[PDB]
Symmetry: D2
Subunit: 231 residues, 4 copies
């Protein structure tokens, strides 16, 4: 099984696998049942922002999700990523729909990792049809609206259930190094989740996995394309 | 009085005004009584590096100091700096000698604040005999060996006593903004602290203060360049 | 007199002091007589973007202006700026109205100089009603719509006549250093130039000047905010 | 055949394939016979710096190679990389020895490419045994001196002839895009060429090639691992 560290933007409470009884942002350490979560009012059809921040000094993995009006959810978790993640990882995005669904749209994604100095930095404020520095997975596609649609969409712009999609930066990232004095990464991505369903599902995750990581089978819905299961 | 947030590389144990009984790094908020410190073994005549990181999500200020051989010292303090720093600040470096002295040689200094974007970034890997972006104060001087001497050094390479100096970056810095999702800043500087005294003193600080902050009188020893008293 | 290097977005053809007979971008060195210009079709009421790039290897200053639909104008001029700019400069934005007027709204501005490293970088995607890193001059004001109005605008959104204004970044900038392998800088700003006049005037400039440079009197029209005369 | 844009740091005049009768830096466009060259005193066992700079506005591909003492060679060439290179490329380093030889050592390599914004940026100030974000080719190796040895070395630190080596960033780079207003890249790398031979050979190249590019067969010596032949 993949090793996973995720921030999750979780639109659909699955309270029978850990979720709080609300949409939430959550920090995920090797598990779908978030180490730490926070109430998050996912704003339908509004374009939202995720910042994820971590460094090996403070050893707090942080995440905000805000929307243009200011409503803002913060989750922090105190964890030493050096002990969870392998030295080398791929960094990526993941979204999933279940029995409920939504567009899981990414309008930009940037990522910096730094070892103090080696550094990788990418920003995608657009995406292309053939996004050669992204590895797309499952239902995920780019172009030509310069967006990345993590889960399936349907001719007329309609979110498809049971979809799971994932983009990963193509370069593995050197995410810690034992001699590094500071190992930090941060990620930002803007997303537009629009649903018309009774309830949106299941959300979007930023993630850091072992390099070769791929969707686990049937990890659509509540497993957000990160976990084989909800253990 | 200057509002003052600082990370101190405190070479001299003033065990009667806070200091633990060894050299240490500390996080000072509006008081030289470090809210927190860690044991730092200062390696005389060695070029170390100080990294200071903070963001408004994690709301944790961290600093690590290391030297080429790898002895690290790390301190972290959970604080909302919105609740302490004025919206605009100047950033700087402070150093002080007292009864005992040391070279307080800053070799490089870099700084990044960011509101998420407004950002400021400067890096000085070489200081100039004339540096029109640094506000020099006290006995701090620059050049032309590409270093910033914070406290006085005679013709012969001798640290002076009861010396005090600072270099703030010239532009004021916008360190928070209550509409900002993430206010973050990190700072790095490398220093080449040397003494042949009985015990080095009194160390170097990275500090954030009000835009007009200046050296408080007789702040020259244990007060680094930062506080007017030990309160 | 100010030493002045500037890239002008020149909305008004003053065909009697240099201007080609159309709107144009120009590279001005120490004279409003553009060493070179290109035809620029200013799109009224459109948010464009100006990029200015220079390094001391290629020794070529380039600027392109574009708007969301893709009309680009590009000018390039081969010049050693070592041979023109003083070692320290302040960078800024200048705009001017005359007989005819325009909104001179700067939406964002960013700047990078680098000596290879010393570097400075700032980006303003949102200006503040109170911006302690900008030196405002003439009729330039900021906030709180997150823009920099360089020239005067009445209560009702009306550009004023014979108006002049600049915002220089606060810190002086170290633009060259004769020991530097590469002195490079690039600048970006987006502007939201609008007029309902017979012909807009007189446009916006990115400029580099001596640290103490200030608006030359009656430099308000065709002189943008830069020269005291058309020499 | 690969498409190649190289800057070459050429230690060995092969005047019967274009080279000037001296060591030189040269710009290479789809050809080993440099479009433009410059005298360059390769300093034996001294650690040198290469900056390569290009943007699609100025359309001058530039390069400096300097050494700690200041001796500095500049080559500039006016070329539109959009017409030579495919949209997607891999960026890399290449070195070769022939009948003559040298260490072709890389101590750091950084690279920024920007489309104006998508951006890729990496810096390697060290390298590791298993440098997962580098694709190594031919004789090229990394670790554990945190260096990259583009051509073979021999137990006791001795340069081997007929060696060709190459490192490429793992992510393809999006090097131009037809809607980009500015497409720029720059690269820096520091190299230590030490020879003890009668004459060093053949030098080091930065290069930008079609993504799948690999050493052409028998492109050691004067072809620097970039070209099938010296056409
Ligand atoms: O922040 C940093 C600044 C500089 C460096 C230096 C790397 C380096 C490595 C070498 O083998 C030789 C050398 O001369 C320099 C590393 C990190
Ligand atoms: O420099 C840049 C700054 C901002 C952007 C914006 C990208 C973007 C793309 C979308 O589909 C929707 C959106 O709301 C924003 C692009 C470049
Ligand atoms: Ca869920
Ligand atoms: Ca003390
Ligand atoms: Ca004019
Ligand atoms: Ca040759
Ligand atoms: Mn959840
Ligand atoms: Mn102390
Ligand atoms: Mn003009
Ligand atoms: Mn050659």
């Amino acid at each position: 099984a993949d090793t996973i560290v995720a921030v999750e933007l979780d639109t659909y409470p699955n309270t029978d696998i850990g979720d709080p009884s609300y949409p939430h942002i959550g920090i995920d350490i090797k598990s779908v049942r978030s180490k730490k979560t926070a109430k998050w009012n996912m704003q339908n059809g509004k374009v939202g922002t995720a910042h994820i921040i971590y460094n090996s000094v403070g050893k707090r993995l942080s995440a905000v999700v805000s929307y243009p009006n200011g409503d803002s959810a913060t989750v922090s978790y105190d964890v030493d990523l050096d002990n969870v993640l392998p030295e080398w990882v791929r960094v990526g995005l993941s979204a999933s729909t279940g029995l409920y669904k939504e567009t899981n749209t990414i309008l930009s994604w940037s990522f910096t990792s730094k070892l103090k100095t080696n550094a990788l930095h990418f920003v995608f404020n657009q995406f292309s049809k053939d996004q050669k520095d992204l590895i797309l997975q499952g239902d995920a596609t780019t172009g030509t609206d310069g967006n990345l649609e993590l889960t399936r969409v349907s001719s007329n712009g309609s979110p498809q259930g049971s979809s799971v999609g994932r983009a990963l930066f193509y370069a593995p990232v050197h995410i810690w190094e034992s001699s590094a004095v500071v190992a930090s990464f941060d990620a930002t991505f803007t997303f537009l989740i629009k649903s018309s369903d009774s309830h949106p599902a299941d959300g979007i995750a930023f993630f850091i996995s072992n390099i070769d990581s791929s969707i686990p089978s049937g990890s659509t819905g509540r497993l957000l394309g990160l976990f084989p299961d909800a253990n």
